[PDB]
Design a protein around this motif. Structure first.
Motif, PDB file in Angstrom:
ATOM      1  N   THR A  27       0.841  -1.191   0.000  1.00  0.00           N
ATOM      2  CA  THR A  27       0.000   0.000   0.000  1.00  0.00           C
ATOM      3  C   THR A  27       0.877   1.242   0.000  1.00  0.00           C
ATOM      4  O   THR A  27       0.750   2.107  -0.869  1.00  0.00           O
ATOM      5  N   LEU A  28       1.772   1.321   0.980  1.00  0.00           N
ATOM      6  CA  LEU A  28       2.681   2.454   1.091  1.00  0.00           C
ATOM      7  C   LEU A  28       3.447   2.635  -0.214  1.00  0.00           C
ATOM      8  O   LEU A  28       3.468   3.723  -0.788  1.00  0.00           O
ATOM      9  N   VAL A  29       4.066   1.557  -0.684  1.00  0.00           N
ATOM     10  CA  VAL A  29       4.831   1.589  -1.927  1.00  0.00           C
ATOM     11  C   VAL A  29       3.942   1.962  -3.114  1.00  0.00           C
ATOM     12  O   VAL A  29       4.344   2.732  -3.986  1.00  0.00           O
ATOM     13  N   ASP A  30       2.733   1.410  -3.144  1.00  0.00           N
ATOM     14  CA  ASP A  30       1.799   1.699  -4.223  1.00  0.00           C
ATOM     15  C   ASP A  30       1.478   3.181  -4.313  1.00  0.00           C
ATOM     16  O   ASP A  30       1.337   3.723  -5.407  1.00  0.00           O
ATOM     17  N   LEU A  31       1.368   3.829  -3.158  1.00  0.00           N
ATOM     18  CA  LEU A  31       1.052   5.252  -3.096  1.00  0.00           C
ATOM     19  C   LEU A  31       1.886   6.099  -4.044  1.00  0.00           C
ATOM     20  O   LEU A  31       3.020   5.757  -4.372  1.00  0.00           O
ATOM     21  N   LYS A  32       1.309   7.207  -4.498  1.00  0.00           N
ATOM     22  CA  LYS A  32       2.026   8.127  -5.370  1.00  0.00           C
ATOM     23  C   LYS A  32       3.052   8.807  -4.463  1.00  0.00           C
ATOM     24  O   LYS A  32       2.851   8.885  -3.249  1.00  0.00           O
ATOM     25  N   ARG A  34       3.857  11.937  -3.791  1.00  0.00           N
ATOM     26  CA  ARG A  34       3.342  12.997  -2.934  1.00  0.00           C
ATOM     27  C   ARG A  34       2.635  12.455  -1.693  1.00  0.00           C
ATOM     28  O   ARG A  34       2.716  13.046  -0.617  1.00  0.00           O
ATOM     29  N   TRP A  35       1.938  11.334  -1.834  1.00  0.00           N
ATOM     30  CA  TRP A  35       1.238  10.758  -0.694  1.00  0.00           C
ATOM     31  C   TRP A  35       2.161   9.852   0.109  1.00  0.00           C
ATOM     32  O   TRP A  35       1.897   9.553   1.276  1.00  0.00           O
ATOM     33  N   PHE A  36       3.241   9.409  -0.526  1.00  0.00           N
ATOM     34  CA  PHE A  36       4.219   8.562   0.143  1.00  0.00           C
ATOM     35  C   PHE A  36       4.902   9.425   1.205  1.00  0.00           C
ATOM     36  O   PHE A  36       5.008   9.044   2.372  1.00  0.00           O
ATOM     37  N   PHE A  37       5.353  10.599   0.781  1.00  0.00           N
ATOM     38  CA  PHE A  37       6.019  11.516   1.688  1.00  0.00           C
ATOM     39  C   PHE A  37       5.059  12.136   2.683  1.00  0.00           C
ATOM     40  O   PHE A  37       5.381  12.241   3.865  1.00  0.00           O
ATOM     41  N   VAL A  38       3.875  12.530   2.225  1.00  0.00           N
ATOM     42  CA  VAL A  38       2.899  13.105   3.142  1.00  0.00           C
ATOM     43  C   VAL A  38       2.599  12.050   4.201  1.00  0.00           C
ATOM     44  O   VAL A  38       2.252  12.359   5.336  1.00  0.00           O
ATOM     45  N   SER A  39       2.769  10.794   3.819  1.00  0.00           N
ATOM     46  CA  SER A  39       2.527   9.674   4.714  1.00  0.00           C
ATOM     47  C   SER A  39       3.670   9.561   5.727  1.00  0.00           C
ATOM     48  O   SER A  39       3.443   9.354   6.918  1.00  0.00           O
ATOM     49  N   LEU A  40       4.904   9.698   5.254  1.00  0.00           N
ATOM     50  CA  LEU A  40       6.062   9.625   6.143  1.00  0.00           C
ATOM     51  C   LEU A  40       6.066  10.828   7.091  1.00  0.00           C
ATOM     52  O   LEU A  40       6.434  10.710   8.259  1.00  0.00           O
ATOM     53  N   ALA A  41       5.651  11.982   6.577  1.00  0.00           N
ATOM     54  CA  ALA A  41       5.590  13.200   7.377  1.00  0.00           C
ATOM     55  C   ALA A  41       4.666  12.990   8.573  1.00  0.00           C
ATOM     56  O   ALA A  41       4.961  13.431   9.684  1.00  0.00           O
TER      57      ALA A  41
ATOM     58  N   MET B 108      16.147  14.810   5.124  1.00  0.00           N
ATOM     59  CA  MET B 108      16.245  13.362   5.253  1.00  0.00           C
ATOM     60  C   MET B 108      15.703  12.753   3.970  1.00  0.00           C
ATOM     61  O   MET B 108      16.337  11.878   3.373  1.00  0.00           O
ATOM     62  N   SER B 109      14.535  13.237   3.555  1.00  0.00           N
ATOM     63  CA  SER B 109      13.881  12.775   2.337  1.00  0.00           C
ATOM     64  C   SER B 109      14.825  12.866   1.146  1.00  0.00           C
ATOM     65  O   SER B 109      15.027  11.882   0.427  1.00  0.00           O
ATOM     66  N   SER B 110      15.412  14.042   0.952  1.00  0.00           N
ATOM     67  CA  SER B 110      16.334  14.267  -0.152  1.00  0.00           C
ATOM     68  C   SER B 110      17.534  13.337  -0.095  1.00  0.00           C
ATOM     69  O   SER B 110      17.990  12.848  -1.122  1.00  0.00           O
ATOM     70  N   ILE B 111      18.053  13.107   1.108  1.00  0.00           N
ATOM     71  CA  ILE B 111      19.195  12.219   1.276  1.00  0.00           C
ATOM     72  C   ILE B 111      18.769  10.801   0.898  1.00  0.00           C
ATOM     73  O   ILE B 111      19.527  10.055   0.280  1.00  0.00           O
ATOM     74  N   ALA B 112      17.557  10.436   1.306  1.00  0.00           N
ATOM     75  CA  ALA B 112      17.021   9.114   1.031  1.00  0.00           C
ATOM     76  C   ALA B 112      16.915   8.922  -0.480  1.00  0.00           C
ATOM     77  O   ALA B 112      17.444   7.960  -1.029  1.00  0.00           O
ATOM     78  N   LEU B 113      16.260   9.861  -1.152  1.00  0.00           N
ATOM     79  CA  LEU B 113      16.099   9.797  -2.596  1.00  0.00           C
ATOM     80  C   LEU B 113      17.429   9.797  -3.350  1.00  0.00           C
ATOM     81  O   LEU B 113      17.643   8.988  -4.261  1.00  0.00           O
TER      82      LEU B 113
END
Ligand SMILES: CCCCCCCCCO[C@@H]1O[C@H](CO)[C@@H](O)[C@H](O)[C@H]1O
Ligand SMILES: CCCCCCCCCO[C@@H]1O[C@H](CO)[C@@H](O)[C@H](O)[C@H]1O
Ligand SMILES: CCCCCCCCCO[C@@H]1O[C@H](CO)[C@@H](O)[C@H](O)[C@H]1O
Ligand SMILES: CCCCCCCCCO[C@@H]1O[C@H](CO)[C@@H](O)[C@H](O)[C@H]1O
Ligand SMILES: [K+]
Ligand SMILES: [K+]
Ligand SMILES: [K+]
Ligand SMILES: [K+]
Ligand SMILES: [K+]
Ligand SMILES: [K+]
Ligand SMILES: [K+]
Lengths: 302, 302, 302, 302
Positions: A27-32, A34-41, B108-113
């Motif tokens: 699910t997480l990986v499937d996410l686009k 923008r939503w992947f990061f908004v999710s990590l945030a 962190m995100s940028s480093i990850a990517l």
């Protein structure tokens, strides 16, 4: 409306079985993104809110806590979880040192995990919807002297894939002469496994061919019988994304009503100046051509 | 000049179709290392310039800001984005704490990517230009009693690849007896799929062979007909880079004018002292040998 | 001593061709872990020595520089390159801020690259020397009514590999009836490609079989001719390391003098209590058995 | 109880051979996530305890050491190993600077290694126990006019796997007519390698078929002989986890007593409303059907 197909045109299987992050992982990986990061945030904020409350359980845990109260504990948590460590605010008590130690471990861990997910996310192939396309219908007509089942496949967005291979199965309920019930029996549909022709050079669209002969499950399929037959041709195309080396798969299906007897595809390839052009407007288009109504069996044996 | 070929000698396909970082992604990865990093450095500076301006929107956001003004905000941004956190300069206001919190997440995100990209970049095989080579021409002459189409392949820079396999397709426009137009029809050219000989032990150069018989698309190709025929032999070689386990592919093409009737390749292998030497000066070289002008068909049926 | 073989018993090819970290990359990865890290440590010290000298070019670049002089610049470099940022020592001048900014970028980059290498290093399969073994000799004797070429293969240290497949090529210099010189011609040695038997279930050692018949390159090989023949049987075994999903390959070779006519292998498998035991002391051992001296050809045609 | 089988129903091989983190590596990865991290936490604490003692060997090594003694050295170690660097406590002596420098290198290294492990851990497929299932028994009965060996396979937890392929081997001790002893001889059991039918479309359970004919190792297997025969059918199913692109394998085995003569499987597939349902309660179930007791050989030759 129409009968229930086992595989949707988009490749989705309509099956239902009976009675570690494995599920939510995709699910997480499937996410686009923008939503992947908004999710990590969100997780980031939650973890920080959590450790912030833990620090608050102790008295004057943080030197130069600013702002005073929860806010300072939150920002100190932030610099701690992400291992920034400005240090103006820093553990002032043994209790705070233990909480910080735990948070530091959790922060590295979280960074490690999030980084892993990002990599996998990056290695994923673009959705089929934007990479591989199949003609809506399949057709049956004479080609090079033989009754042939055909359908078309093309690769849109250059997904840099190699090792492209295609397989075709006929799904049909049947009963064996011995009386065995076989609801979703799978029969092989030869589309090149015996010539190497199933190993595709897919740049421009291709018309996949299944020659109908004595060994074909369609040996006795006629124009008439098609009207009462019930089957589903499942198509499986696999390839590897060059850039990442990841193996991907696209699937489609053709029920009996989506196979047109006596039809032929319009061409899609045209020679221009400097290059060959692909007219995608003709991709799904077919037209009628003189074709006998008899099955190959009725013809070989009449 | 010459007709328009579908695949260039270097493997590039001359096709054009009709009307998330996916495109620019390969670009970044494709870049040479020096430009990959110079590229990341630019983003780094831009992100820092951006967060620096955000800090400046607040008043006295940073303790001991040095130098005063934008410069200090820039360097503080640097230590924040990269999670260094010297801390002499540090957030002094709630506003600055929120900006720093956001920058820390983005960092962190940028480093990850960037780390993900680096890994993929590292897993990529070296360009074909420096790994796999094909002879400029193909030839047709008698070998072991049979008219054979041959061309040569070799692996230069030891790219540690295994699972090396070769496939060959004949691209030709044709019309079926039933009147179907097939602009870029692909016919299989057997080069070992029925003996396992297409699974190559590619250390020193190899001469790939396609035996011309009744099942070959070239069954009726004669010296004369070659002069007016129009086709393109597309060659696909795939392997896996051992070190990384990545599957790669090299392609080439031979149009009718690049196939020499009655020719044979010069040998490239020679036995020295302690090793076998490969003379690459003979790689593309061929010479004429006594060969009948008739097609295999004219000969089997005369 | 003995003739020059193209492939050593250990799989090493004795070939020599003619006139981005690609080469040194495998070297680093190839290194044992202790030397891999001792290697990274050296780069670490060098980079730090380098940035330390740069800081020294400016005057009083670092606050609370300790120790005074190069030493303090070195330790400050360390906390900067690795993004630790204690901050007691920190940039005090614009010049130092630019050097630190550059070092921070280089440090992240270096960490990124070193991390990539570590991953690849981790994904590598253990050396053949400790994973796959081949019998020193091959033999030729009657099995199930047919003259057969055999050799043994076993998988020691459970390298968790799947998709194990074996291929065999005969390397021999020859001249075609048409007069073509072929120094290192490769002929296919069928060891199961036509039965699926080349897809191995390699747990305990296996005796690989090549049936000598009319289609075999050894069709006319007799005990006598073996004494003057010159060839090399090259064996290629490929598998995938389950844990990592990495494809690996082990190779060996058998020259004419390493093929024993009229021999049979001793068994290595024995049934114990609770398990089957593999006696590796018999791995390479063979004994003589009644075998006709004639080639299959002399026998089918006498 | 029962004879000693070479492969357990769960795929475990009962073999025993004779006389860099390779072994403990899989162990760590094999561990469940909770124990994976609890495991890393332990190393973290140990490394910190170790560096803490080293700092204590010097006098007043750390500025503002808090708490005084070992405790402060421990927490300073923590902020150093993880590269947090609050810096309130920081190296105060050259000796402490060298220890910190070494710890910083070790910390980055450890983070790099732990991160690599996490990625691999993430790329691993879920255990067979929760992904692929095989019927407890296999059966032999007539299907489409031929005596057939069958067993069932299904994919539970959608492990998003593609490139699914199945292979079957017959393990049996035998003696060749020439007198060669073959304790665990492996014979190929054709289950689709010659039709492409071994390349499975595994969504709902499938009944795998091995047709018993003249080329089958079971050509002379009869109901009677089964009672005294000793063999083991080993099944190998391989696929690739789409999400990760990792190749996985599931294995099972059927000894002579686990093969039921004259039996047929109950169906498991049923058509509902909107989908096809899989009744797993019938997965292992079989019932008797009229089947001749003779081997195919006794029948073709009587
Ligand atoms: C310095 C910052 C670098 C940021 C790099 C971001 C790379 C994002 C890659 O996304 C992936 O691209 C693939 C095509 O290439 C798609 O198939 C896949 O679905 C998509 O998830
Ligand atoms: C501690 C610093 C370590 C730095 C390691 C840098 C490794 C750079 C690897 O580059 C890759 O090498 C491959 C061959 O191995 C090429 O095929 C590929 O195209 C190229 O991109
Ligand atoms: C928290 C610290 C974790 C450290 C983990 C170190 C893992 C080192 C793995 O080394 C690799 O093991 C493979 C077998 O598994 C070998 O085939 C390969 O050649 C070898 O390079
Ligand atoms: C921001 C925090 C992100 C945390 C992400 C944690 C991902 C954990 C994935 O575990 C893996 O899932 C696979 C199925 O997907 C299993 O097959 C495998 O055995 C299991 O090890
Ligand atoms: K810091
Ligand atoms: K600090
Ligand atoms: K990091
Ligand atoms: K792979
Ligand atoms: K991979
Ligand atoms: K850090
Ligand atoms: K830091």
């Amino acid at each position: 409306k129409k009968r229930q197909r086992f595989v949707d045109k988009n490749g989705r299987c309509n099956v239902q079985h009976g009675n570690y992050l494995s599920d939510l992982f995709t699910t997480l990986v499937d996410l686009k993104w923008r939503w992947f990061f908004v999710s990590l945030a969100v997780l980031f904020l939650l973890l920080n809110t959590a450790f912030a409350t833990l620090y608050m359980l102790g008295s004057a845990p943080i030197a130069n806590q600013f702002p005073a109260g929860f806010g300072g504990a939150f920002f100190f948590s932030v610099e701690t979880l992400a291992t920034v460590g400005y240090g103006d605010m820093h553990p002032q008590t043994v209790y705070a040192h233990w909480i910080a130690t735990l948070e530091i471990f959790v922060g590295m861990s979280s960074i490690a995990l999030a980084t892993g997910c990002a990599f996998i996310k990056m290695s994923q192939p673009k959705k089929r919807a934007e990479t591989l396309m199949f003609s809506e219908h399949a057709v049956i007509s004479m080609r090079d002297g033989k009754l042939t089942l055909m359908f078309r496949v093309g690769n849109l967005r250059n997904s840099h894939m190699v090792s492209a291979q295609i397989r075709c199965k006929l799904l049909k309920s049947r009963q064996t002469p011995e009386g065995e019930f076989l609801p979703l029996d799978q029969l092989e549909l030869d589309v090149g496994f015996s010539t190497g022709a199933d190993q595709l050079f897919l740049v421009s669209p291709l018309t996949i061919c299944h020659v109908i002969d004595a060994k074909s499950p369609f040996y006795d399929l006629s124009q008439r019988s098609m009207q009462t037959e019930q089957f589903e041709v499942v198509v499986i195309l696999e390839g590897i994304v060059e850039t990442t080396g990841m193996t991907c798969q696209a699937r489609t299906s053709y029920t009996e009503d989506e196979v047109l007897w006596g039809h032929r595809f319009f061409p899609v390839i045209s020679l221009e100046e400097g290059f060959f052009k692909v007219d995608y407007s003709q991709f799904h288009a077919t037209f009628e051509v003189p074709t006998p109504p008899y099955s190959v069996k009725e013809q070989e044996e009449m």
